[PDB]
């Protein structure tokens, strides 16, 4: 199996984008800033890569990050992982 | 090698007491002249009180058979040595000439009983003049009326190493 493509959400919180940094205190924080411009269009950009996962990609997984701020842990840096969807009709896996 | 049939005639050396010896003759299948003379001395010493030094060869004449085109069926008797004993045998070879029949026999013995040239005696080679006088099945098979058969699964030999279409074995 090989990851054909990844489609991300328009808005990412701070605690999740801290995962992509070694020094968060030194940053313009520059995280998915040019990716957010992929949204703000009516139907142009995101739907193609979503349809790419529809036409191909017999396996669909979902990227989730923990709400580590709710726990008493002093980390502040969330944990990101893929959880595979095991529903049906991979097209509606992408829709879900 | 490829065999030739020679007749070899030899005799004991003449002497004052007994001149005009008996001039024994024997037919030999051999590759060349020197072997034909040798095999004559080999076999003659097995019958008579004679050897190469105590006798002479008078003549050698290669025998090539009358009809190199007519297909025969030969009955052949031999005497050969196995790893454990000496055994007699009788077979047929169906082919075009007498020498090619012997050339088949030597390969045939070498293939079935691992009998090399040294351990084989060819007793006599005769034509089976009458059909239905054949007693072995592998040569009796080809004597049927209007014999015909195909050659399925023909394999062409390619000159180039690469062929641009899958070969077909129709024939």
């Amino acid at each position: 199996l090989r990851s054909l493509t990844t489609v991300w959400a328009e808005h990412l919180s701070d605690e999740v984008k801290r995962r992509f940094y070694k020094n968060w205190y030194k940053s313009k924080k520059k995280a998915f800033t040019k990716y957010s411009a992929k949204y703000a269009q009516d139907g142009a950009g995101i739907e193609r890569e979503l349809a790419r996962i529809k036409k191909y990609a017999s396996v669909v997984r979902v990227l989730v990050h923990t709400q580590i701020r709710k726990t008493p842990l002093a980390q502040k840096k969330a944990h990101l992982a893929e959880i595979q969807l095991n529903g049906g009709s991979i097209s509606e896996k992408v829709d879900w | 090698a490829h065999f030739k049939e020679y007749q070899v005639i030899g005799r004991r050396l003449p002497t004052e007491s007994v001149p005009e010896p008996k001039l024994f003759r024997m037919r030999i299948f051999a590759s060349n002249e020197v072997i034909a003379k040798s095999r004559y001395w080999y076999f003659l010493q097995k019958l008579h009180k004679v050897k190469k030094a105590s006798g002479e060869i008078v003549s050698i004449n290669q025998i090539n058979e009358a009809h190199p085109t007519k297909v025969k069926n030969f009955g052949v008797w031999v005497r050969y040595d196995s790893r454990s004993g000496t055994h007699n045998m009788y077979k047929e070879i169906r082919d075009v000439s007498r020498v090619a029949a012997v050339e088949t026999l030597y390969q045939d013995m070498a293939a079935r009983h691992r009998a090399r040239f040294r351990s084989i005696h060819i007793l006599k080679v005769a034509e089976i003049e009458k059909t239905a006088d054949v007693k072995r099945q592998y040569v009796k098979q080809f004597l049927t009326k209007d014999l015909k058969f195909p050659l399925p699964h023909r394999v062409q030999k390619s000159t180039k190493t690469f062929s641009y279409k899958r070969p077909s074995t129709f024939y």
Binding site: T66, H79, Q84, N86, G88, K93 | -
Partner: protein, 49 residues
């Protein structure tokens, strides 16, 4: 010469090597098999001991 007495070996050879993990979060190397008849659902979750 053989061991005078038998004993099972110490430890399991399928958990080799006893090296440090590559990360603090262990990776899921197998997800449950999929039958495309049930509704869409996650198969795992993340929590803290």
């Amino acid at each position: 010469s053989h061991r005078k007495y038998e004993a099972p070996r110490h430890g399991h050879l399928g958990f080799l090597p006893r090296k440090r993990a590559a990360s603090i979060r262990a990776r899921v190397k197998a997800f449950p098999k999929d039958d495309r008849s049930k509704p869409v659902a996650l198969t795992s979750f993340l929590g803290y001991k």
